[PDB]
C-alpha cells in the first residue's frame, strides 16, 4: 500500500435532445481501469487497462447490468432534484458523485468517501465517521432525512469497509506494481528578453509522472517566495506532465539564480542554472 479504488460518476440531462448522458469512471491508484459510457446503442462496462482483460465475461456482464441500473436510478434523481429546487423541466443539469476507498499498507480502510454535487456544487456527503451526512443546502436535507431513516450510512460503511476493499485487493493482484510507475522530470532553463536591463529565466520540468512536483528558484540559497511566475501542471498528452517556473532577474546576474525540482521519482532534487551556449 497505500492503494485506492475510486469511481467518478457523471449524469447530465439534455431535455429534448436525448436521454441523460451517464458515465462511471473507475481508477485503481489514480489510473483509469474501467469505464461505462451510456452514450451508445449497446453500452457496456469496458476494460480501460489491458491488465483488466483478465476479468471474465461474468464480470463485465454483472458490472454492465449494475451500471445500467445505476443509470436509471440517476435518471430518476435528476427529476427528483428539479422538484426539490423548483427548476424548469427544460434545462440541462448535472449530478456528480465521487465514491471510493483509500486503503493503507496494512490492508485496512484509511478513508472511505461518498459525495454528491448538483450543478457543480456540494449537495451531500458521507462524513468521515462513515455514520453521518453533511447536507449542503435545504434540498439536501430532504435526501439526508430519507437516508438517515433507511440507514443508508450503514449500507455505505459496509460497502466501504468490505466490498470496496476486497475488490481493490482483487484488482491489484492483476495490475499492481503498475500503479507504482514513476517517471522522473528532466529539467532545463531557458533565457528570455525583457525591456531595459531585465531578463527572464524559465525553469522547465518535462516528462514526469505522477503530476505532483515542486519547482523553486533561489537567489544565493533562499527561495524566491514572491514574483515567481508559474503555470499549473499540465499533461503532455503522452501520460507525462509538464510545469515551469520563471523569475525576472537583472541582466548580467543570471548565474546568481538556481532552480530546484522536487519529485518523488528523483534520487534527489535537481539543481540547475541558465547555461548559455559557448
Amino acid at each position: 500500500g497505500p492503494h485506492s479504488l475510486r469511481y467518478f460518476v457523471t449524469a447530465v440531462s439534455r431535455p429534448g435532445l436525448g436521454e441523460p448522458r451517464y458515465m462511471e469512471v473507475g481508477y485503481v491508484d489514480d489510473t483509469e481501469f474501467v469505464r461505462f459510457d451510456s452514450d451508445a446503442e449497446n453500452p457496456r462496462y469496458e476494460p480501460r487497462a489491458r491488465w483488466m482483460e483478465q476479468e471474465g465475461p461474468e464480470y463485465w456482464e454483472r458490472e454492465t447490468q449494475k451500471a445500467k441500473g445505476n443509470e436509471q436510478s440517476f435518471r430518476v434523481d435528476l427529476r427528483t432534484l428539479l422538484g426539490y429546487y423548483n427548476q424548469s423541466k427544460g434545462g440541462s443539469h448535472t449530478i456528480q458523485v465521487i465514491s471510493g476507498c483509500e486503503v493503507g499498507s496494512d490492508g485496512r480502510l484509511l478513508r472511505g468517501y461518498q459525495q454528491y454535487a448538483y450543478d457543480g456544487c456540494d449537495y451531500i456527503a458521507l462524513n468521515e465517521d462513515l455514520k453521518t451526512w453533511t447536507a449542503a443546502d435545504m434540498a439536501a436535507l430532504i435526501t439526508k432525512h430519507k437516508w438517515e431513516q433507511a440507514g443508508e450510512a450503514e449500507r455505505l460503511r459496509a460497502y466501504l469497509e468490505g466490498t470496496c476493499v476486497e475488490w481493490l485487493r482483487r484488482y491489484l493482484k492483476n495490475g499492481n506494481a503498475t500503479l507504482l510507475r514513476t517517471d522522473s522530470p528532466k529539467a532545463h532553463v531557458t533565457h528570455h528578453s525583457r525591456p531595459e536591463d531585465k531578463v527572464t529565466l524559465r525553469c522547465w520540468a518535462l516528462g514526469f509522472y505522477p503530476a505532483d512536483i515542486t519547482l523553486t528558484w533561489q537567489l544565493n540559497g533562499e527561495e524566491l517566495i514572491q514574483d515567481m511566475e508559474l503555470v499549473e501542471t499540465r499533461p503532455a498528452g503522452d501520460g507525462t506532465f509538464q510545469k515551469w517556473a520563471s523569475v525576472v532577474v537583472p541582466l548580467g546576474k543570471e548565474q546568481y539564480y538556481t532552480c530546484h525540482v522536487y519529485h518523488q521519482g528523483l534520487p534527489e532534487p535537481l539543481t540547475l542554472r541558465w547555461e548559455p551556449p559557448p
Binding site: K66, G69, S73, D77, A150, L156
Partner: peptide, 8 residues
Amino acid sequence: SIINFEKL
C-alpha cells in the same frame, strides 16, 4: 466494483 446507488 462500484456501489449500487440509492435514490436522492
